[PDB]
Amino acid sequence: HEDFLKCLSYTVEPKVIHTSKDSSFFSILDSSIQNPRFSVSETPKPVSIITPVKASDVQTVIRCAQLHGIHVRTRSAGHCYEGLSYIAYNKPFAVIDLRNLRSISLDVDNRTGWVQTGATAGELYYEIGKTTKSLAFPAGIHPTVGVGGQFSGGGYGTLLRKYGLAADNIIDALVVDASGRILDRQAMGEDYFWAIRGGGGSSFGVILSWKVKLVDVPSTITVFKVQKTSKKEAVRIIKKWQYAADKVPDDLFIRTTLERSNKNAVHALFTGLYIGPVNNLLALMEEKFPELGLEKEGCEEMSWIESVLWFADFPKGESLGVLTNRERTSLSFKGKDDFVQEPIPEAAIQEIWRRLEAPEARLGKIILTPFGGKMSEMAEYETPFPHRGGNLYEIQYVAYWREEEDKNKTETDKYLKWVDSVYEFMTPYVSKSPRGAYVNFKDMDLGMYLGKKKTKYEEGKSWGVKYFKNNFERLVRVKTRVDPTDFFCDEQSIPLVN
Ligand SMILES: *Cc1cc2c(cc1C)nc1c(=O)[nH]c(=O)nc-1n2C[C@H](O)[C@H](O)[C@H](O)COP(=O)(O)OP(=O)(O)OC[C@H]1O[C@@H](n2cnc3c(N)ncnc32)[C@H](O)[C@@H]1O
Ligand SMILES: [Cl-]
């Protein structure tokens, strides 16, 4: 690692290379940890962090690492559910933090833009929304999530039924491969270009930039919220949502969240985004979902960019500038998810409601996100993300807790157990053989490389088919061509072929 450091100085700037002796080290590392439970002293620390400022720096890191046997991890904005962008287990590593490469240059008239991978979804949103009210981009709702990790793993949000995933809307890209070669879509090839758009970027290289396709939105859209605190009534409505939500027009997004209310009781929160006017939303909802009981008072017409702040839980009429904040979260979490292919029984709905009444589920959520629309229109093979037609909705079980509590691992166990238990309960009701999982919600509990099988291929196949289903074999083929040394690897990365 010593020579490695020297190798970097042979130009890669001195003051973008951090090690433990640098006063500005634990701060650089701690800054973009967006799951605080993985910021504890007992978790593995890197022996160096590099914050590149030009592409050439990244190249040098890739080339020098391989030359001196140094393992790396790449961080954009650090929302990895298991912290695998700044944690490597059982072998010393360094971190390529992309915080300095976040330049966003749009071409609003040609509906494209280049987005450097250090940028957050919020920054991208801000750049678009401040410039034009008639364009958008389909990514997640949480502004501090980086485009690096999110886009390379798929990326859904309130426009998925209309426009699909973020990865479904990328038309070129720059990646540094195991050589240190900077490759655009033309230079990298279609197989490479495919793999990086959902396959999990940590398996394929260092993605430097995305070329996005901007999508059209009306200057006026409509959001709505309906709250149901009565279990009986809410369970009734959720049953109906299960049949309606994935079949409504592409313009209508209806999410169901089960969680605590301010009055410390379980409720069902139905929130949505309609790509059109309020009267059209209302007529559509009495037709397809009159059980929700939506009325004008539950609705609000605003711009799409304003709907971003809305879904991101900011005060109404807040300045768009909050999209640009990259502040550290204070809530640790454990998340798992599932895909539902046919409506779960009323009995299932009541039980998962019941489990949220648990004391340790006070900051927990069960979130039901409707697919259908563009999501069933697109075929499995089109991008590595496999969960298309046949999936009614995706469901995430996530428990949050205050980072203070992390001081006693034994105490935060109850949250893990909570999340594990509801997931186990849901087994008979969700997809099976394989049980589908979303790679942007990384879960070591589905399996990791430890030495269970002879080769990495047979061991990695285990969780591989859960994340990627029938797309797993292609990813492995692409992986074998583009990265035959297997330089880019973590605890769940795509394996080389046998
Ligand atoms: C933190 C979070 C995440 C999240 C969410 C809510 C919160 C609080 N809700 C989501 C949702 O509603 N919909 C959705 O699609 N995703 C949601 N997530 C998950 C989030 O998208 C993923 O965690 C995403 O992968 C995180 O991306 P980010 O860039 O912020 O995180 P990272 O730790 O730095 O990276 C994660 C993995 O990707 C690799 N990576 C990152 N950058 C690159 C580049 N440029 N090249 C190659 N690989 C890259 C990391 O190595 C890591 O494995
Ligand atoms: Cl998100």
Author numbering: 28 to 37, 43 to 530
Q: What do the authors of the reporting publication say about this deposited model?
A:
Among these, the flavin-dependent oxidoreductases berberine bridge enzyme-like enzymes stand out, because of the bi-covalent attachment of the cofactor to the protein via a histidine and a cysteine. Here we report the crystallographic structure of AtBBE-like 28, a member of the type II BBE-like enzyme sub-family. AtBBE-like 28 functions in biomass formation and salt stress tolerance.
Crystallization was conducted using the sitting-drop method, yielding crystals diffracting to a resolution of 1.8 Å. In the case of AtBBE-like 28, the cysteine is replaced by His174, which does not form a covalent bond to the C6-position. However, the covalent linkage established by the conserved GGHD motif was clearly seen in the crystal structure (His111 in Fig 3). The flavin adopts a butterfly-bent shape, with an angle at the N5-N10 axis of 6°. Asp369 and Glu426 are found at a distance of 2.4 Å, indicating that they share a proton. An additional interesting feature of the active site is the proton-relay established between the putative catalytic base, Tyr188, and the neighboring acidic side chains of Glu426 and Asp369, which presumably activate Tyr188 to facilitate proton abstraction. In AtBBE-like 28, this position is occupied by Val177 and thus we assume that the pocket is available for oxygen binding. In agreement with this assumption, an electron density in this pocket was clearly detectable and we propose that a chloride ion, acting as an oxygen surrogate, is bound to the pocket (green sphere). The distance between the chloride and the C(4a) of the isoalloxazine ring is 3.1 Å. AtBBE-like 28 features a hydrogen bond donor to N(5) (Nπ of His174) and a catalytic base to initiate substrate oxidation (Tyr188) and hence shares the hallmarks of a flavoprotein oxidase, as proposed by Fraaije and coworkers.
